[PDB]
Design a binder for this molecule. Sequence first.
Ligand SMILES: COc1ccc2cn[nH]c(=O)c2c1OC
Ligand SMILES: COc1ccc2cn[nH]c(=O)c2c1OC
Ligand SMILES: [Cl-]
Ligand SMILES: [Mg+2]
Ligand SMILES: [Mg+2]
Ligand SMILES: [Mg+2]
Ligand SMILES: [Mg+2]
Lengths: 194, 194
Amino acid sequence: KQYIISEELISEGKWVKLEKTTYMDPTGKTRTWESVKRTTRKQTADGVAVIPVLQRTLHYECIVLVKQFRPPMGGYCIEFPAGLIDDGETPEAAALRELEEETGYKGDIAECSPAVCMDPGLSNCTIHIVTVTINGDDAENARPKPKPGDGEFVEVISLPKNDLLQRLDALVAEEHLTVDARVYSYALALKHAN
Amino acid sequence: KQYIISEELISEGKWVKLEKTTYMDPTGKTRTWESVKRTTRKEQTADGVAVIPVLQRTLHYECIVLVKQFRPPMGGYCIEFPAGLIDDGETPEAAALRELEEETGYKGDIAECSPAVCMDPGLSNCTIHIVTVTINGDDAENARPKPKPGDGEFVEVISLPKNDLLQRLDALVAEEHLTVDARVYSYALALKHA
Ligand SMILES: COc1ccc2cn[nH]c(=O)c2c1OC
Ligand SMILES: COc1ccc2cn[nH]c(=O)c2c1OC
Ligand SMILES: [Cl-]
Ligand SMILES: [Mg+2]
Ligand SMILES: [Mg+2]
Ligand SMILES: [Mg+2]
Ligand SMILES: [Mg+2]
């Protein structure tokens, strides 16, 4: 019933562009929308986000998260490890790579989502969510070596999976940080389950 | 360590603007970023709300109520939590209950309200509150719910059992071209992982 008629470029940066989208509404009426896109898409999706499940025997299972300054937010955010997919990289491979660069951990793929949208009333940005387990008792994950690219400055924060929502709430109250909506959604559902 | 030095408008639409952001990196060097913001945010603690609506009914499994709409930025149909912007002076809770009733017909009860969480913080400053609401589906109010959709709003309701949410979503993606929202997918994944 609805579809895109045309897209008019408004402004194109190096990394992000802004378009005016014309579309057909279901009544037969032509309407416009302001849409954002990345200039970097190639690929199945723009990026990946990694759900990294740190598994150490006789310890609580942890979700590994990252804390970074985010210029669009003007502040620090707590997020799943994440980056753009290199041209000719599988989502799985982008996941293990971004997890290593950001956390130093070496992980194993558990499952991989279809492409899923980030904020579809604003942008066409999509990611694959990739669930990865980390054998925290293996020697390669003993002293994890985080390999930042240029301009990445990442702090690693591991939180117990069984208390994740309360732990995130605590960081927000004490540390004046913003939690990512996907991380919060995950945490909420761990509480809502059964 | 890191902070914003300047925010230069690049291009301003009616709804969305693009900025050149200058910030201080943790080495003490000046860097830039391209940043998206909405033009509609005022004194609200966030741009919007998304609603996790738990539909509860005697001798029924709980359902998660979702919505399907055409999203012009995406060029197609998306499945998402009911959601909308917070009106000036409106509380996040009120906005959630309002959007839920407008998009689904259901009258909910507030359960919990998150702090402001970031939608895509490498791109935009956009934030929402995630508001968990229960819907008493035994109540006459919620018997034959009809959406009160706004002008240009065209929303289909899809209620899926919480206990099988991820597979049910996969079965919808398998049957037509549509994108699941990353918050929905994350929430469904944690239901599985729990
Ligand atoms: C009914 O409200 C709207 C009308 C046009 C637009 C256009 N571009 N983006 C929006 O987000 C938008 C919107 O939603 C805030
Ligand atoms: C380290 O790579 C980058 C350098 C500058 C930028 C600037 N604006 N947006 C980005 O998303 C971005 C980026 O990440 C894709
Ligand atoms: Cl797992
Ligand atoms: Mg990253
Ligand atoms: Mg990275
Ligand atoms: Mg909406
Ligand atoms: Mg609405």
